[PDB]
Design an enzyme around this catalytic site. Structure first.
Site, mmCIF file in Angstrom:
data_model
loop_
_atom_site.group_PDB
_atom_site.id
_atom_site.type_symbol
_atom_site.label_atom_id
_atom_site.label_comp_id
_atom_site.label_asym_id
_atom_site.label_seq_id
_atom_site.Cartn_x
_atom_site.Cartn_y
_atom_site.Cartn_z
ATOM 1 N N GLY A 60 0.838 -1.185 0.000
ATOM 2 C CA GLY A 60 0.000 0.000 0.000
ATOM 3 C C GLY A 60 0.872 1.234 0.000
ATOM 4 O O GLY A 60 2.090 1.150 0.294
ATOM 5 N N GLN A 65 3.053 10.014 2.097
ATOM 6 C CA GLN A 65 4.359 9.372 2.111
ATOM 7 C C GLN A 65 5.238 9.823 0.973
ATOM 8 O O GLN A 65 6.474 9.720 1.052
ATOM 9 C CB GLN A 65 4.224 7.856 2.041
ATOM 10 N N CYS A 103 6.862 -0.251 7.226
ATOM 11 C CA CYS A 103 6.366 0.924 6.517
ATOM 12 C C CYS A 103 7.468 1.398 5.589
ATOM 13 O O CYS A 103 8.639 1.406 5.964
ATOM 14 C CB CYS A 103 5.967 2.011 7.512
ATOM 15 N N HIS A 145 -3.544 0.889 8.412
ATOM 16 C CA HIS A 145 -2.205 1.514 8.305
ATOM 17 C C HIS A 145 -2.187 2.681 7.373
ATOM 18 O O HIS A 145 -1.621 3.742 7.679
ATOM 19 C CB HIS A 145 -1.207 0.425 7.920
ATOM 20 N N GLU A 146 -2.779 2.526 6.210
ATOM 21 C CA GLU A 146 -2.828 3.635 5.248
ATOM 22 C C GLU A 146 -3.704 4.811 5.705
ATOM 23 O O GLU A 146 -3.340 5.985 5.514
ATOM 24 C CB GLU A 146 -3.291 3.142 3.885
HETATM 25 C C1 LIG Z 1 1.195 -4.519 7.303
HETATM 26 C C2 LIG Z 1 0.516 -3.175 7.088
HETATM 27 C C3 LIG Z 1 1.425 -2.249 6.267
HETATM 28 C C4 LIG Z 1 1.154 -2.403 4.785
HETATM 29 C C5 LIG Z 1 1.682 -1.207 3.956
HETATM 30 C C6 LIG Z 1 3.190 -0.984 3.966
HETATM 31 C C7 LIG Z 1 3.612 0.107 2.974
HETATM 32 C C8 LIG Z 1 3.383 1.439 3.647
HETATM 33 O O1 LIG Z 1 4.158 2.021 4.385
HETATM 34 N N1 LIG Z 1 2.219 1.953 3.487
HETATM 35 O O2 LIG Z 1 2.056 3.173 4.080
HETATM 36 C C9 LIG Z 1 3.915 -2.234 3.592
HETATM 37 O O3 LIG Z 1 3.798 -2.723 2.495
HETATM 38 N N2 LIG Z 1 4.677 -2.771 4.544
HETATM 39 C C10 LIG Z 1 5.360 -4.046 4.436
HETATM 40 C C11 LIG Z 1 4.941 -4.918 5.599
HETATM 41 O O4 LIG Z 1 5.197 -4.550 6.729
HETATM 42 N N3 LIG Z 1 4.303 -6.052 5.441
HETATM 43 C C12 LIG Z 1 3.767 -6.574 4.195
HETATM 44 C C13 LIG Z 1 2.859 -7.694 4.671
HETATM 45 C C14 LIG Z 1 3.267 -8.083 6.069
HETATM 46 C C15 LIG Z 1 4.045 -6.889 6.611
HETATM 47 C C16 LIG Z 1 5.323 -7.353 7.316
HETATM 48 O O5 LIG Z 1 6.051 -8.265 6.486
HETATM 49 C C17 LIG Z 1 6.883 -3.825 4.425
HETATM 50 C C18 LIG Z 1 7.612 -5.036 3.881
HETATM 51 C C19 LIG Z 1 7.261 -2.623 3.562
HETATM 52 ZN ZN LIG Z 2 3.294 3.106 5.900
#
Ligand SMILES: CCCCC[C@H](CC(=O)NO)C(=O)N[C@H](C(=O)N1CCC[C@H]1CO)C(C)C
Ligand SMILES: [Zn+2]
Ligand SMILES: [Br-]
Length: 182
Positions: A60, A65, A103, A145-146
């Site tokens: 997302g 951001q 994030c 989160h978003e």
């Molecule tokens: C989980 C809720 C956050 C989802 C959105 C975020 C991206 C972000 O900062 N959005 O503002 C993301 O993809 N984060 C990933 C993330 O934390 N994830 C993706 C799915 C599970 C979780 C941990 O691995 C990381 C790898 C960049």
């Molecule tokens: Zn984020």
């Protein structure tokens, strides 16, 4: 009449079209302005958000951001992306579940965050049509989160473990003083 199609390839890009901002940056703490007009210019921004998201391997991305002060979110969890314009959480449901979150604005930091399992959201889609969605699991988590980002809230704000918070921010070069209460 829309003339911009949202048909974005998932690719690593040498130079992503939009620039990320990182924890400490005041752009991440500014409540987003409503989207006034859903037009082709906004659709090109949507495309650039998706390209930026995919290149950074996110699921997302919220417009703040990338320094765009608008209530606009793109989400794609799949191995058709979801576009939320002026969303509102109508309510939450289920139990409170603690899972690891990261994030794109806080690279390398993974911490446990407690959230409601289920969320209902209303929003306008990329064509301006009013929609409503109920989500659970990772999708519900990402949506919340978003939506946090649209309100100037970052996931570190919700982290209850002071030891793990400080250690993770320390190891990745971020300041605990950039954390805010909820
Ligand atoms: C989980 C809720 C956050 C989802 C959105 C975020 C991206 C972000 O900062 N959005 O503002 C993301 O993809 N984060 C990933 C993330 O934390 N994830 C993706 C799915 C599970 C979780 C941990 O691995 C990381 C790898 C960049
Ligand atoms: Zn984020
Ligand atoms: Br700060």
């Amino acid at each position: 009449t829309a003339a911009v199609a949202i048909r974005v390839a998932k690719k690593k890009l040498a130079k992503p079209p939009l620039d990320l901002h990182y924890l400490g940056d005041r752009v991440l703490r500014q409540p987003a302005k409503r989207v006034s007009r859903i037009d082709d210019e906004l659709r090109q921004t949507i495309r650039q958000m998706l390209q930026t998201m995919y290149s950074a391997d996110g699921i997302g991305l919220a417009a703040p951001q990338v320094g765009i002060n608008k209530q606009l979110i793109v989400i794609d969890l799949e191995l058709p992306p979801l576009v939320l314009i002026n969303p509102k959480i109508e309510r939450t449901a289920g139990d409170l579940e603690q899972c690891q979150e990261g994030c794109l604005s806080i690279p390398g930091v993974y911490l446990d965050v407690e959230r409601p399992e289920i969320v209902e959201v209303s929003y306008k889609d990329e064509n301006g049509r009013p929609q409503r969605l109920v989500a659970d699991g990772l999708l519900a988590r990402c949506i919340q989160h978003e939506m946090d980002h649209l309100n100037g809230v970052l996931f570190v704000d919700r982290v209850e473990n002071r030891l793990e918070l400080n250690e993770a921010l320390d190891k990745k070069g971020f300041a605990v003083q950039a954390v805010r209460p909820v």
